[PDB]
Design a protein around this ligand. Structure first.
Ligand SMILES: Cc1cc(C#N)cc(C)c1Oc1nc(NC2CCN(Cc3ccc(C(N)=O)cc3)CC2)ncc1-c1ccncc1
Ligand SMILES: [Mg+2]
Lengths: 414, 556
């Protein structure tokens, strides 16, 4: 690769001017060592004060690894980089990736460092290694090659990636391969035994066709990904409180499902009764409950993925290490719901658990639709922004907003 | 002649679309013109400026200004127009160091780099934009035209380009001398080390020998100011640091700007003076922008101000950082949403102190404010020391565990230990997760007419107890809260409450312990008095008995 691709920002937009956030000493030291090596290899170069742009940088440790990885937060630059088409009008998302028995994720971002970047665009990738206590000037760099995390890197490299994968794609027509940013998602239907070595067959390919983190594989099983429909209790004796919670849940579900009825169940709540008093169900209420239970078994109707609109992901903390979540584009039309439990290594850290939930939900969103959702997080902004980088292990970063008012809805996914 | 290396030129451009300045030269007196000609003549011999022909179409006005005792003239090129059209730069001098993060240095030398400032060449393709004109005597010859060859004083890019050029020159010297520290701001160069005073200086001339590679003369700074160094408003002493002496003025009439300068003194003081409070003072500056407006001080601002003077009686000093020791932060609650903290490595020797004020809002509680103070101190400590301190907090471990395991939001506090320093942060009430057996059940409701603002609130219970109260000048949301308040007032120590108010649930489920709404505060006071409260929600207008009965009792 010797001839670059012309790239521009979007009309009427300057480069990013995003403040670098504070870094611990151990992350500064790791970034200094990493960037010293990248500079010797020519991937980045020092810049002068005539470059006013900046993009934040930090360092992570990937899952089951011991060496630091540089992570640039290109979220603002990506928003300002022109939309890509170039080679074709766009590759459609493989709807079959989500139905494979096993999907392995590979970090192929190091391959991007072999393609030079447009010399006119390089100034927009500027970043700063800060110093502790501002005692020295921050070390300023810009990229000479396609950077990991930039929207333009997989698009520009797509032609080269296709030619490297072609001998393997010809051999195996049943293996789905999807690329998202620095990640390669390789889905098969054969068993785990030498699915690993067939994935190892991928590694020697890129190795001979061209890495610090190539050796690792993030293994998923989307065929065994469970959904969470709406479930009504099954009881032999219903208290006033039980029926009251049931009517509230059914009233909420009526906004989602047509024909939900509570009038017969509301008739049992006739009078001013103690909350713990047992109420025998009438058969008209028993019948109404049965019809609602049947309605809630069929899927919601009029629910389609619109690739022009954003995906929204809402998350609720349910306690005891359990988290529920819903993905949608319009309210009350969920495209996906789910629930997690036992976030490893975080039994006494809420924020670490939430951070892992965000990464898992984003991974699922990439597999199903090929993009990341915008999160509504049940956490105060100042708590999240202080800590999330300490537990981040992915090479992409989604967008998020914060929920400050407790939703009444947590009870009805409980 | 010893060959000197050229200082690498920074390429500069104007903002896109913009052109260079074209400002007309002001009329000058014959006296000022003679002054400007002699000065610019000297500057041309030094290489700073150069005469240009008439084809350069840009111009910036020049002036001549007189001083106080020095009966001299000095020029002033007014680059305000050029600065507007100059590109933005990376300013490497946003955040200054904090003294509490600095380490002790046995020896410190201060050298002047003023003469070196003019060895920094200006980008050649940009010089044409710096053109200025000396008008001629009696306007009878063409004005003499000049442009700069070096960074002009008052030009936008001069501080950034000068600092960057010095850093690039100094980088190999610091990297191969890890025993010293080099810090530059403005035209002073500070060099510190833990080398003894003889060996120290040898490195100093070693730095001079390195700096002469680019032909930079660097003598010691005129009138070595003996300690403490007055830097960015601090007082840097060999073993300690402090704020420059603060004096709170004595006044009988306090206006807007006096109180605005008073928060700045107290805020600046709060970094080392423990226990400073500024709320009841900062509260008097709510919505006014007339800096001459006089405002009477509350009796609480006098109490707060008099408390500040007592803290400011004797100067306080902080220690410098020792990486071998641990880093500890201790927080105290001060009241009215105010918090103070101290950061130290050994007891009673603070590295620094500070304060935290709660954010604006209708409802709040102490645990959330404590969490916010922790995150602010954490972020500040990362900046100053590159690490999180260990926390000493006035909250019991059991209190925190109950809070975060039950709170609807994710929350986290880093490694910390309880310190028994009243007033302790507590949970003042805890709602039940399940209905209480044997407790009376209150179905509450309220409603108001938006036309007349007349409303009713009340309850009915499973024992037949009932109340409806008529209300004036109220809203739907206030009557829903009043109904809950009535149920709490008239019930025993354990009570089940059923409401249809999503607004009231949203407030109570936020677990406030204090509010600006007097009605919410009354509800909190009742909840503190109870043994057990179960609060249940039901949808309105849905045939739910008790709720239907009380809804039309209140709906007039
Ligand atoms: C931020 C900063 C401001 C000034 C000023 N003006 C000066 C310096 C050198 C400086 O930079 C650093 N200053 C420190 N220490 C400080 C300097 C030393 N005093 C004590 C002292 C001792 C003996 C004397 C004496 N002999 O009279 C007088 C005073 C303590 C503060 N340490 C590290 C750095 C640093 C710089 C660059 N990169 C990394 C670190
Ligand atoms: Mg009502």
């Amino acid at each position: 690769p010797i001839e670059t691709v012309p790239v521009k920002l979007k009309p009427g937009m300057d480069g990013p001017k995003v403040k670098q956030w504070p870094l611990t000493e151990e992350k500064i030291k790791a970034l200094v060592e990493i960037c010293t090596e990248m500079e010797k290899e020519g991937k980045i170069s020092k810049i002068g004060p005539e470059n006013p742009y900046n993009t934040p940088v930090f360092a992570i440790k990937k899952k089951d690894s011991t060496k630091w990885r540089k992570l640039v937060d290109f979220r603002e630059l990506n928003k300002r980089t022109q939309d890509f088409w170039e080679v074709q009008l766009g590759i459609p998302h493989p709807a079959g990736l989500k139905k494979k028995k096993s999907v392995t994720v590979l970090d192929v971002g190091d391959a991007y460092f072999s393609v030079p970047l447009d010399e006119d665009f390089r100034k927009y990738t500027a970043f700063t290694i800060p110093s502790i206590n501002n005692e020295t000037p921050g070390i300023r760099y810009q990229y000479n090659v396609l950077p990991q995390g930039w929207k333009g890197s997989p698009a520009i490299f797509q032609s080269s990636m296709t030619k490297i994968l072609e001998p393997f794609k010809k051999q195996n027509p049943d293996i789905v391969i999807y690329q998202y940013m620095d990640d390669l998602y390789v889905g098969s239907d054969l068993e785990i035994g030498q699915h690993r070595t067939k994935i190892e067959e991928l590694r020697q390919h890129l190795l001979r066709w061209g890495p610090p983190f190539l050796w690792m594989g993030y293994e998923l099983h989307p065929d065994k990904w469970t959904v969470q429909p709406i479930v009504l209790p099954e009881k032999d004796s219903w208290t006033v409180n039980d029926i009251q919670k049931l009517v509230g849940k059914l009233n909420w579900a009526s906004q989602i499902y047509p024909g939900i009825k509570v009038r017969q169940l509301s008739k049992l709540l006739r009078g001013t009764k103690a909350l713990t008093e047992v109420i025998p169900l009438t058969e008209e209420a028993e019948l109404e409950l049965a019809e609602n239970r049947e309605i809630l078994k069929e899927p919601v109707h009029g629910v389609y993925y619109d690739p022009s609109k954003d995906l929204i992901a809402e998350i609720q903390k349910q306690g005891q290490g359990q988290w529920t979540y819903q993905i949608y584009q319009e309210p009350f039309k969920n495209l996906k719901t789910g629930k997690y439990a036992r976030m490893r290594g975080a039994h006494t850290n809420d924020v670490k658990q939430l951070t892992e939930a965000v990464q898992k939900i984003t991974t699922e969103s990439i597999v199903i639709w090929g993009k990341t959702p915008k999160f509504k997080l049940p956490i105060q902004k100042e708590t999240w922004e202080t800590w999330w980088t300490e537990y981040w292990q992915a090479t992409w970063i989604p967008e998020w907003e914060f929920v400050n008012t407790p939703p009444l809805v947590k009870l009805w996914y409980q | 002649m010893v060959p000197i290396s050229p200082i690498e030129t920074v390429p500069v451009k104007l903002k896109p679309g913009m052109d260079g300045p074209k400002v007309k030269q002001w009329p000058l007196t014959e006296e000022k013109i003679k002054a400007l000609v002699e000065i610019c003549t000297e500057m041309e011999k030094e290489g700073k400026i150069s005469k240009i022909g008439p084809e350069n179409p840009y111009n910036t006005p020049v002036f001549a200004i007189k001083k106080k005792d020095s009966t001299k003239w000095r020029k002033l090129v007014d680059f305000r127009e050029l600065n507007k059209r100059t590109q933005d730069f990376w300013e490497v001098q946003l955040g200054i160091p904090h003294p509490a993060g600095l380490k002790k240095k046995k020896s410190v030398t201060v050298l002047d780099v003023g003469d070196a400032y003019f060895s920094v060449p200006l980008d050649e393709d940009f010089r044409k934009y710096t053109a200025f004109t000396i008008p001629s005597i009696n306007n009878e010859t063409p004005g003499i035209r000049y442009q700069y060859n070096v960074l002009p004083q008052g030009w936008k890019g001069s501080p950034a380009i000068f600092q960057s050029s010095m850093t690039k020159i100094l980088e190999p010297f610091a990297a191969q001398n890890p025993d010293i520290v080099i810090y530059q701001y403005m035209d002073d160069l500070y060099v510190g080390s833990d080398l003894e005073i003889g060996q120290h200086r040898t490195k100093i001339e070693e730095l001079r020998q390195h700096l002469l590679r680019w032909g930079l003369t660097t003598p010691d700074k005129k009138h070595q100011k003996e300690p403490p160094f007055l830097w960015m408003g601090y007082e840097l002493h060999p073993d300690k640091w402090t704020v420059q002496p603060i004096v709170l003025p004595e006044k009988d009439s306090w206006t807007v700007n006096d109180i605005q300068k008073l928060v700045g003194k107290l805020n600046w003081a709060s970094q080392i003076y423990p226990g400073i409070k500024v709320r009841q003072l900062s509260k008097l500056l709510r919505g006014t922008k007339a800096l001459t407006e006089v405002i009477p001080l509350t009796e609480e601002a006098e109490l707060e101000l008099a408390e500040n003077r007592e803290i400011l009686k004797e100067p306080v000093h902080g220690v410098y950082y020792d990486p071998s020791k641990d880093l500890i932060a201790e927080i105290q609650k001060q009241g009215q949403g105010q918090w103070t903290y101290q950061i130290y490595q050994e007891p009673f020797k603070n590295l620094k102190t500070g304060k935290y004020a709660r954010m604006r809002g209708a409802h709040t509680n102490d645990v959330k404010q404590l969490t916010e103070a922790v995150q602010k101190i954490t972020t500040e400590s990362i900046v100053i020391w590159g690490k999180t301190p260990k926390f000493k907090l006035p909250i019991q471990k059991e209190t925190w565990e109950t809070w975060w395991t039950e709170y609807w939001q994710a929350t986290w506090i880093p490694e910390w230990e309880f310190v028994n320093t009243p007033p302790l942060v507590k949970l003042w009430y805890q709602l039940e997760k399940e209905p209480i057996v044997g407790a009376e059940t209150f179905y509450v409701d309220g409603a108001a007419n938006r036309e007349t603002k007349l409303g009713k609130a009340g309850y009915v219970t499973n024992k037949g107890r009932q109340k409806v109260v008529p209300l004036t000048n109220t809203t739907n949301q206030k009557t829903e809260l009043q109904a809950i308040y009535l149920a709490l007032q008239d019930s025993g120590l354990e009570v089940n409450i059923v409401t249809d108010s999503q607004y009231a649930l949203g407030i109570i489920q936020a677990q406030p312990d204090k509010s600006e709404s007097e009605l919410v505060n009354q509800i909190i006071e009742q909840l503190i008095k109870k043994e057990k409260v179960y609060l249940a929600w039901v949808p309105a207008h849905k045939g739910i008995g008790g709720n239907e009965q009380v809804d039309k009792l209140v709906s007039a």
